[PDB]
């Protein structure tokens, strides 16, 4: 199974007669499908990873200034000027400082001084544009019916077997065919890049850290930057919001810069989308992926199946899920071949009848070995109850208050 | 659009080695910018330049400071080059291309009009 | 700056065949616009693909729809993708950008073959 050990589960029921069960999937949340008379899948978005990107801008939050040069002319002769003011690496300023006979010249007044400095880059970030034509949605399923993970020791296993598969979900291709397999094929028309992810985003990148940034956000960000193309010796656009020079007392203006500026925009994207994980694919950390699902070639796998009658023997504890349904694991022991296991809540012992819900439609004994496990999921009434699983004779039962 | 592209066959060294083409089929005088590129036979391609239909404008390989001189006949409708003082490493298959650089939907911008080839070597 | 290019091509007819084209650590693969061109032995090389993105691609003259191209900015390497194999396209093949100062670079020439 799956979608047991989790909070953010939404159970969804299926129209009788209908084939069409649109749902919403999202990070770190669960959905758990059921029907009247198919059987109950849960689907879940697992990862969102978007991968090559093209950068747009890089921003300069670290700059390193050097060669302080000026040139300086008096009050009367005009205005200053220094040859590094045509250069694409330089960022200068004209003002006005305090000239007369005590420093160079015979008449006082302001004369003009140009300060130049070579601007350099420490540590910049780059944003890329995340074109909707390169992401990939993943979808995971899980039909119940099952222990925990046979045969397959990890949790996503494989794709190769029955109730364990990966959808694949990107614009472009947004319809996907899920076969299952013995069940049938699980139809998922999703909605890709419209349910969240609009074009104003841009995968931000900036020392390992990432983020998803709106549009005109990224585009006056107040630093040093370049354009979408990459080469030797960068020419940096803006030089001068990193790189300070204001007036002094006099007769000289002072070039200081502006430090760091991580922390700075640490701080100055609050509460926007992150995209942390890395691996050379932007792995997102939200998710809003609207989706329709299409019941129309799934089926139940144990209706051709007769009851099991060697009866049961619990392994674990039953436990209180989250939302109130109840999970048992119980051990056959009974080489009956492939049965229906009988699973049932009984208030009573006169007759069993139904009193509540069942989340795993007709649970199914697998193999034809001695002794197999399996896992079941049921809805239970409000109040005292019990539980009951297999024929009359050797009866299992468990006590059970919810709520 | 037809591209015609004819020339000597030898050319000695340290001489001045010189190809033209014609433009069989449109205009110079248009904005389109015709070029050469040299290859060796089993090497690989390696662009001489391209002159302008409009302005004149030359721009060749960085290895070739001062050695290569596209020249060009606007009236006439040819273009040509001029490779001067040849070196005898310079045997190769020349080709006469026309590409665009001003815009036109940047596919053009590859060159998409070829010659036919020119086989020339540097000997004694 | 140059375009490295693998020598060597082997596929089964009917496959996708793949051919890459690594541009140097100077130059950045998703931000130049990819040029193929196609050539045998005794003809000029002609146009055969034009690839930036998969929202701005144009195809040769007479080139089918199954050449397509991608890009891996990764390991920073353009591709040129030949489903279906057919006999006439058995040629080498070449890649071709422009850099900062408008010089074309080529690469070193894919010999494809197919089986």
């Known amino acids: 199974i799956r979608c047991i050990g989790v909070s953010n589960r939404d159970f969804v029921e299926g129209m009788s007669g209908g084939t069409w069960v649109d749902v919403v999937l999202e990070h770190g949340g669960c959905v758990t499908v059921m029907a009247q008379d198919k059987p109950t899948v849960d689907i879940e978005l697992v990862t969102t990873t978007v991968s090559n990107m093209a950068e747009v801008r890089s921003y300069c939050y670290e700059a390193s200034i050097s060669d302080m040069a000026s040139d300086s002319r008096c009050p009367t002769q005009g205005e200053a000027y220094l040859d590094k003011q045509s250069d694409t690496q330089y960022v200068c300023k004209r003002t006005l400082v305090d000239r007369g006979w005590g420093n160079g010249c015979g008449l006082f007044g302001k004369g003009s001084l140009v300060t130049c400095a070579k601007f350099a880059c420490s540590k910049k970030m780059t944003g890329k544009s995340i074109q909707p034509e390169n992401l990939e949605y993943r979808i995971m399923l899980s039909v119940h019916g099952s222990q925990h993970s046979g045969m397959i020791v990890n949790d996503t296993g494989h794709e190769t077997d029955e109730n364990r598969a990966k959808v694949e979900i990107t614009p472009n291709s947004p319809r996907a065919e899920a076969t299952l397999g013995g069940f049938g094929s699980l139809g998922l028309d999703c909605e890709p890049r419209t349910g969240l992810d609009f074009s104003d985003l841009y995968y931000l990148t900036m020392n390992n850290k990432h983020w998803l940034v709106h549009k005109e956000w990224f585009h006056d960000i107040p630093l040093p930057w370049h354009a979408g193309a990459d080469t030797g010796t960068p020419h940096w656009n803006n030089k001068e919001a990193l790189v300070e020079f204001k007036d002094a007392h006099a007769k000289r203006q002072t070039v200081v810069v502006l430090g760091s500026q991580e922390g700075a925009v640490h701080t100055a994207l609050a509460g926007a989308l992150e995209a942390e994980m890395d691996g050379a694919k932007g792995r997102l950390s939200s998710g809003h992926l609207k989706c329709r699902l299409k019941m129309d070639k799934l089926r139940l796998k144990g209706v051709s199946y007769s009851l099991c009658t060697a009866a049961f023997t619990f392994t674990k504890i039953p436990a209180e899920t989250l939302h109130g349904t109840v999970t048992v694991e119980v051990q056959y022991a009974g080489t009956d071949g492939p049965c229906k296991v009988p699973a049932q809540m009984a208030v009573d012992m006169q007759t069993l009848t139904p009193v509540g819900r069942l989340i795993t439609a007709n649970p199914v004994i697998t193999e034809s070995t001695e002794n197999s496990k399996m896992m079941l999921e049921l809805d239970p009434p409000f109040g005292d109850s019990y539980i009951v699983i297999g024929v009359g004779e050797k009866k299992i039962t468990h006590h059970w208050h919810r709520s | 659009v037809q591209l015609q592209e004819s020339g000597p066959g030898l050319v000695k060294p340290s001489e001045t080695l010189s190809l033209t083409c014609a433009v069989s089929?449109?205009?110079?005088?248009?904005?389109?910018?015709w070029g050469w590129i040299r290859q060796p036979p089993g090497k690989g391609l390696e662009y001489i330049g391209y002159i302008s239909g409009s302005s004149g404008s030359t721009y060749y390989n960085p290895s070739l400071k001062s050695r290569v001189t596209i020249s060009k006949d606007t009236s006439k409708n040819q273009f040509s080059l001029k490779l001067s003082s040849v070196t005898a490493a310079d045997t190769a298959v020349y080709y006469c291309?026309?590409?665009?650089?001003?815009?036109?939907?940047?596919?053009?911008?590859?060159?998409?009009?070829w010659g036919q080839g020119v086989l020339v070597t540097v000997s004694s | 700056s140059v375009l490295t290019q693998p020598p060597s091509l082997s596929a089964s007819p009917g496959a996708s065949a793949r051919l890459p084209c690594t541009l140097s650590?100077?130059?950045?693969?998703?931000?130049?616009?990819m040029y193929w061109y196609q050539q045998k032995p005794g003809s000029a090389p002609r146009l055969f693909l034009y690839?930036?993105?998969?929202?701005?691609?144009?195809?040769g003259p007479g080139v089918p729809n199954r050449v397509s191209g991608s890009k891996e900015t990764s390991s920073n390497t353009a591709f040129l993708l030949i489903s279906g194999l057919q006999p006439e396209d058995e040629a080498d093949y070449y890649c071709?950008?422009?850099?900062?100062?408008?010089?074309?670079?080529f690469g070193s020439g894919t010999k494809l073959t197919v089986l």
């Open positions: 690839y930036y993105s998969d929202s701005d691609k144009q195809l």
């Open positions: 650590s100077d130059l950045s693969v998703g931000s130049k616009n």
């Open positions: 291309a026309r590409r665009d650089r001003v815009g036109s939907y940047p596919y053009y911008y590859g060159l998409d009009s």
């Open positions: 071709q950008v422009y850099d900062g100062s408008a010089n074309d670079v």
């Open positions: 089929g449109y205009s110079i005088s248009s904005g389109y910018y």
